[PDB]
Homo-oligomer: A and B are copies of this chain.
Amino acid sequence: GKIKISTPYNLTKRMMMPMLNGFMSQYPEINIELTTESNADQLDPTEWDVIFRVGPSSLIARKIGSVKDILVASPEYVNAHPMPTHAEDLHDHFLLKGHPLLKWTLINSKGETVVNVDRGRFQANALNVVRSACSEGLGITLMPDVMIKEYIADGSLVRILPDWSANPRDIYMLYNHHLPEKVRLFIDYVIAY
């Protein structure tokens, strides 16, 4: 009962695992083989049973969620510097940047974009270690709001430049056009979660 799936590389633990744990717990006789993937455009759709990606033609696509990247910093960073009042002042701050959000393409409530390609104080190919550096007070970062809700809630991380964000991207489940019963049970479970 093996299902082979691909999931967004940074979002998998916080966003997909409760759903996947729920499914496995309900269907003990089904194996899941998971691959976290940084860029699903390079996948061969025929190779997988279901693909979860962020961002949007022989495949069935169904939106299952959304995520909005936001700028944040710890309270001790905020207290040690004047925080930026407009998006240009980011050039004067320590930046912390994680793949795939390395080239920041920020956007405000009126559609204009400010592009920031400053070299971060800290750059990594994974966002979890960038969050750790941000929590330690080493600067401002651009981070999916869902990965950091626990810290936003009590102000361990605080939102800076609240009128700005990355353009929210939707999250999709994709699969191909019979179809084994293991795959459709899983698709249906995802749609109902």
Which residues of A approach B to under 8 Å, CB–CB?
A: 1-2, 12-13, 16-17, 20-21, 24-25, 28, 31-36, 94, 119-126, 128-129, 132-133, 136-138
Partner of A123, one of B31, B120, B123, B138: B31
Q: Does the CB pair A21–B138 fall under 8 Å?
A: yes
Could you show 21 A-B contacts with beta carbons less than 8 Å apart?
A1-B119, A2-B119, A12-B129, A13-B132, A17-B129, A20-B122, A20-B129, A21-B132, A21-B138, A24-B133, A25-B137, A28-B94, A28-B121, A28-B138, A32-B121, A32-B123, A34-B124, A35-B124, A35-B125, A36-B124, A36-B126
Q: Does the CB pair B123–A25 fall under 8 Å?
A: no
A12→B98 CA distance, assembly (Å): 14
Q: Does the CB pair B128–A13 fall under 8 Å?
A: yes
Q: Which 9 A-B pairs have the closest CB atoms?
A: A34-B124, A21-B136, A33-B123, A17-B132, A35-B125, A32-B122, A13-B129, A36-B126, A24-B138
CB distance from A83 to the nearest CB of B (A): 17
Residues of B with C-beta under 8 A to A12: 126, 129
Residues of B with C-beta under 8 A to A138: 21, 24-25, 28
Question: Nearest chain-B residue to A97 (Cβ)?
Answer: B33
A20→B96 CA distance, assembly (Å): 13
Residues of B with C-beta under 8 A to A31: 119-123
Question: Nearest chain-B residue to A98 (Cβ)?
Answer: B34
Partner of A133, one of B17, B121, B122, B123: B17
Partner of A34, one of B13, B17, B129: B129
A124→B12 CA distance, assembly (Å): 11
CB distance from A52 to the nearest CB of B (A): 13
A1→B17 CA distance, assembly (Å): 38
